Design a protein around this ligand. Structure first.
Ligand SMILES: *[C@@H]1O[C@H](CO)[C@@H](O[C@@H]2O[C@H](CO)[C@@H](O[C@@H]3O[C@H](CO)[C@@H](O)[C@H](O)[C@H]3NC(C)=O)[C@H](O)[C@H]2NC(C)=O)[C@H](O)[C@H]1NC(C)=O
Ligand SMILES: *[C@@H]1O[C@H](CO)[C@@H](O[C@@H]2O[C@H](CO)[C@@H](O[C@@H]3O[C@H](CO)[C@@H](O)[C@H](O)[C@@H]3O)[C@H](O)[C@H]2NC(C)=O)[C@H](O)[C@H]1NC(C)=O
Ligand SMILES: *[C@@H]1O[C@H](CO)[C@@H](O[C@@H]2O[C@H](CO)[C@@H](O[C@@H]3O[C@H](CO)[C@@H](O)[C@H](O)[C@@H]3O)[C@H](O)[C@H]2NC(C)=O)[C@H](O)[C@H]1NC(C)=O
Ligand SMILES: *[C@@H]1O[C@H](CO)[C@@H](O[C@@H]2O[C@H](CO)[C@@H](O)[C@H](O)[C@H]2NC(C)=O)[C@H](O)[C@H]1NC(C)=O
Ligand SMILES: *[C@@H]1O[C@H](CO)[C@@H](O[C@@H]2O[C@H](CO)[C@@H](O)[C@H](O)[C@H]2NC(C)=O)[C@H](O)[C@H]1NC(C)=O
Ligand SMILES: *[C@@H]1O[C@H](CO)[C@@H](O[C@@H]2O[C@H](CO)[C@@H](O)[C@H](O)[C@H]2NC(C)=O)[C@H](O)[C@H]1NC(C)=O
Ligand SMILES: *[C@@H]1O[C@H](CO)[C@@H](O[C@@H]2O[C@H](CO)[C@@H](O)[C@H](O)[C@H]2NC(C)=O)[C@H](O)[C@H]1NC(C)=O
Ligand SMILES: *[C@@H]1O[C@H](CO)[C@@H](O[C@@H]2O[C@H](CO)[C@@H](O)[C@H](O)[C@H]2NC(C)=O)[C@H](O)[C@H]1NC(C)=O
Ligand SMILES: *[C@@H]1O[C@H](CO)[C@@H](O)[C@H](O)[C@H]1NC(C)=O
Ligand SMILES: *[C@@H]1O[C@H](CO)[C@@H](O)[C@H](O)[C@H]1NC(C)=O
Ligand SMILES: *[C@@H]1O[C@H](CO)[C@@H](O)[C@H](O)[C@H]1NC(C)=O
Ligand SMILES: *[C@@H]1O[C@H](CO)[C@@H](O)[C@H](O)[C@H]1NC(C)=O
Ligand SMILES: *[C@@H]1O[C@H](CO)[C@@H](O)[C@H](O)[C@H]1NC(C)=O
Lengths: 120, 425, 120, 120, 28
């Protein structure tokens, strides 16, 4: 529908992967209807985080929240040239909810500093 | 010395021929479920597309094939909660009536509120709804399908339906007056919904419709092909005046716990003949209008005759009037080769409507006197191959073609890439 | 629902045009339901291309892919001051899928050059 | 689903507030289905205004339309340090449709000035 | 059902019974 080409490099390192109409309530129609609703729900579910973090229309957006070393103690050579995006998630999956809240407020405080900056 | 780069544009005036689902809108209930449609905008906005000519084709439209299925679904959805007349398929014992339009007085055994008990009740049945067994008669439908009589609270009143296009799609309305129905149209505008289209079911004569702004316009596909239905659209409407004179009475039986079959009671007063009146020198005035336009395509004398023959619904001016379904004989209307004229009509109670595979409806008797007045705005002829045209009409979907010939559904493709001298720095 | 005002200038040149609740599964309810789903599907269908090309929130976004003259040999006076957006599409409709892939990767390579630039 | 935390400061001043699967058409299933469709419809209903005003991914975006004093004659101390966002809406609810059209075209004219600027 | 056997594994019966028809009062 979109693409599973992102998934091509699921075993590659993090540095390599990153670099008709009419509705009929038949058993297949109800099946194919929820698939259409379940797609736009899961799509906007991710797309509203990108918007609220100030990253809509971006694939790679840099933030302003420093990397708290308690989230991971590994080196940049141990991450981007060793771990895969699939296993790196399992190591950091505890702090993902703790990180998503910091990127959410780093964008919020950046917005009020701009409304004071452009007022000159 | 150009240095052109691709530039993306969001919201460019370009569309694509497409078919989608059209939802309904209505103004401020009947079978057409107009209470379920969203309220129409009181100011129907229209955007004129200057310098635009689009190719329409009223005969390869999908609004027709989609509206036809909606009316059939609106019909069947309204008969779902109504009473089934399976026990009414019993052996009838009928006699004639009084010392055309034959009526019978039939007595039969019928169920009641309690399963073990019966009742000997009698009812009037029009001769057309009933066949002889070989005087023991039988309802004409019992050998092929069951029948669901209409819930007597719903009405078949045709009220305007607005077909709208979804968000991201559009409807192109051809505004050229003498538009042939097919080919390019020089006066094209876009709209969100169509106008108010009344689902008026009729045969041969198109009742209650949109007129030609000037000169009786004729529409078809292959005019040289006689198997293709011709559709006339009058410019000035001749008024047909119909009435069933007999003062009928409703007699409610009880064929079960909650099931009440409404039988035709007595006929209080005189026994007359249901019919329709249209004005001579007005049907004759508007038939020489259809005449001179039929010869613009066929060089030659043109003749008018009656229907071919066969079923009653195919060979008659079948329509609806106050609740009962008339079947008028239009041999006296199409009878001229180029004060009133009365059409003898019969009235049926067992109708199949959409010519479906075994599904009928018992039209209950409307108590009192019935009379309706209907404009005759359209026509549908059928050539043979002395260019005679008999009032036929082909299919039922041609009714909706006569009103949808101006509209066409297209989808918006608001994305466009074009070269410019700008580069993303 | 939105607007067909864009369509006002469908015959104009490219330089002129550019410049209640409760669900009931009745025959009309199912009809009006898919129209609601068919709208958000076709809307995001276009809106995800704008996002993946780095053009979300933009009406006119300039890119970095040069104009390959094999797509069209006409002059800038032959395009913006002659052809209409409706007929220009028919001339270029063969390479639209070939162009949409270049704008898709021009944005992708721009993202990795920014993650190297802002690292200084 | 998202958050009603925005609503925490509904009585605060404007300066303080700003600073499983399978579908079954049971009576609850049809009820829970329209709630899912009614969410993505109302969400994009707001999110397309933010996009067409050139403010997608933004919480506070400054515009270029000057404040016509006929919309409100109050002072900046009378607004941000007195009125609440709930009552300020009732005072300005007449011109909201008149303001939403100016922000819509201020973005549109900004787009054509950029396509002329980046052409140098 | 009123059944008899078949002919002078897989047993088959020839069964006669009263059945309704197009009309409620008549049988076959
Ligand atoms: C032929 O059919 C007619 C059915 O349409 C019969 O009924 C007559 O129709 C006339 C036309 O409408 C009526 O006259 C109208 O009266 C109203 C009331 O004042 C006026 O507004 C109309 O202008 C007027 N129309 C005309 C043309 O005068 C008659 O009133 C009506 N008849 C009766 C008894 O009411 C005709 O009777 C019928 N003729 C024959 C010979 O069968
Ligand atoms: C269709 O035909 C019917 C009957 O042919 C027409 O109905 C007739 O309408 C006229 C209108 O004036 C009635 O005349 C008036 O009747 C009243 C009551 O009797 C009387 O007080 C007046 O002085 C006047 O005579 C007439 O009675 C009525 N006839 C019947 C049988 O109802 C109807 O107008 C026609 N519709 C058309 C032509 O659109
Ligand atoms: C063509 O259009 C005309 C008018 O739009 C239709 O005449 C209308 O017929 C209906 C009945 O079929 C009349 O409405 C109802 O009458 C009953 C009986 O009294 C009443 O109980 C209802 O409350 C309602 O009044 C309606 O008055 C009448 N319109 C006019 C102007 O007289 C005609 O039936 C249409 N023809 C076809 C074939 O649909
Ligand atoms: C249901 O009854 C109708 C009416 O009798 C049948 O149509 C008749 O078919 C017989 C065939 O033997 C003809 O002799 C009659 O002339 C037909 N009548 C009409 C009015 O056409 C119809 O075939 C029956 N349906 C079934 C499934 O048997
Ligand atoms: C039947 O036709 C007549 C004549 O065209 C219609 O009466 C016209 O109605 C329109 C709309 O209100 C008016 O603008 C005209 O002035 C009317 N003409 C006359 C002579 O009165 C009538 O509405 C039509 N009725 C139906 C049911 O189609
Ligand atoms: C049709 O016949 C019925 C009787 O079956 C008439 O009904 C009567 O109408 C008068 C009107 O003045 C009433 O006073 C009576 O009470 C009615 N009788 C009944 C039993 O309801 C009816 O009027 C006739 N229709 C017409 C048009 O005359
Ligand atoms: C149809 O026939 C029945 C006969 O079965 C008629 O009913 C009779 O009506 C007369 C007149 O009121 C009564 O004296 C009899 O007692 C009735 N007989 C029965 C068995 O009910 C009935 O009137 C006829 N229908 C019509 C419309 O004439
Ligand atoms: C419709 O009415 C006409 C008369 O108005 C009927 O015409 C008659 O048809 C029979 C059968 O072919 C002929 O023998 C007669 O000579 C005709 N009489 C005429 C023309 O005056 C016609 O039968 C009717 N049709 C229906 C289906 O009822
Ligand atoms: C009702 O059924 C009885 C037999 O049970 C029969 O004798 C009588 O004639 C029937 N009456 C009718 C069909 O009107
Ligand atoms: C209708 O008119 C158009 C004029 O554009 C013509 O091309 C077409 O052949 C005509 N068709 C019929 C059936 O008259
Ligand atoms: C198009 O139709 C409108 C309707 O009023 C009319 O004013 C205009 O002159 C028409 N234009 C052409 C080219 O037919
Ligand atoms: C047809 O017209 C002829 C001649 O006017 C007439 O004799 C005949 O009765 C008419 N037929 C019908 C059915 O009106
Ligand atoms: C049919 O029913 C009758 C009684 O009404 C009975 O005598 C007869 O045997 C039955 N025939 C069958 C079951 O074949």
């Amino acid at each position: 529908a979109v693409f599973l080409g992102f998934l091509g490099a699921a075993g590659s390192t993090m540095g390599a992967a990153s670099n008709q109409h009419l509705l009929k309530l038949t058993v297949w129609g109800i099946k194919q209807l929820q698939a259409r609703v379940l797609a736009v729900e899961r799509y906007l579910e991710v797309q509203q985080l990108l918007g609220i973090w100030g990253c809509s229309g971006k694939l790679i957006c840099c933030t302003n929240v420093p990397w708290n070393s308690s989230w991971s103690n590994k080196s940049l050579d141990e991450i981007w040239n060793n771990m895969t995006w699939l296993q790196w998630d399992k190591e950091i999956n505890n702090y993902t909810q703790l990180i998503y809240r910091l990127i959410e407020e780093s964008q919020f405080q950046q917005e009020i500093n701009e409304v004071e900056l452009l007022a000159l | 010395a150009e240095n052109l780069w691709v530039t993306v544009y969001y919201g460019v005036p370009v569309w694509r021929d497409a078919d989608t689902t059209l939802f309904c809108a209505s103004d401020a209930h009947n079978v057409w479920a107009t209470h379920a449609c969203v309220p129409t905008d009181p100011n129907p906005q229209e955007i004129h597309l200057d310098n635009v000519t689009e190719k329409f084709n009223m005969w390869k439209n999908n609004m027709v094939e989609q509206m036809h299925t909606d009316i059939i679904s609106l019909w069947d959805q309204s008969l779902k909660p109504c009473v089934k007349l399976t026990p009414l398929c019993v052996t009838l014992h009928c006699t004639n009536f009084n010392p055309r339009e034959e009526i019978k007085n039939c007595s039969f055994n019928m169920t009641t509120e309690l399963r073990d008990k019966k009742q000997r009740v009698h009812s009037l049945f029009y001769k057309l709804d009933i066949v002889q067994i070989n005087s023991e008669y039988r309802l004409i439908n019992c050998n092929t399908s069951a029948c669901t009589q209409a819930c007597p609270k719903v009405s078949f009143e045709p009220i305007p339906i607005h077909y709208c296009a979804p968000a991201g799609f559009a409807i192109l309305k051809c505004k050229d007056e003498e538009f042939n129905g097919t080919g390019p149209c020089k006066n094209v505008s876009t709209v969100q919904c169509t106008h108010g289209i009344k689902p008026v079911v009729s045969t041969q004569l198109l009742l209650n419709g949109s007129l030609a702004k000037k000169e009786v316009k004729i529409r078809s596909e292959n005019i040289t092909n006689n198997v293709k239905t011709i559709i006339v659209q009058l410019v000035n409407p001749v008024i047909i005046n119909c009435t069933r004179p007999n003062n009928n009475t409703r007699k409610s039986i009880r064929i079960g716990p909650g099931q009440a079959f409404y039988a035709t009671g007595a006929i209080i007063g005189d026994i007359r003949q249901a019919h329709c009146n249209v004005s001579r020198s007005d049907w004759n005035k508007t038939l020489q209008q259809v005449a001179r336009q039929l010869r613009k395509h066929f060089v030659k004398t043109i003749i008018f005759t009656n229907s071919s023959g066969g079923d009653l619904e195919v060979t008659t001016h079948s329509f609806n009037c106050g609740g009962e379904f008339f079947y008028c004989n239009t041999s006296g209307l199409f009878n001229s080769t180029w004060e009133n004229i009365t059409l003898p009509c019969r009235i049926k109670q067992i109708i199949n409507m959409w010519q479906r595979t075994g599904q009928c409806m018992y039209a209950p008797p409307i108590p009192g006197v019935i009379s309706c007045v209907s404009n005759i705005t359209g026509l549908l002829l059928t050539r043979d191959g002395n260019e005679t045209f008999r009032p036929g009409g082909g299919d039922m979907r041609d009714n909706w073609r006569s009103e949808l010939y101006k509209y066409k559904v297209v989808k918006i493709e608001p994305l466009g890439v074009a070269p410019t001298r700008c580069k993303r720095r």
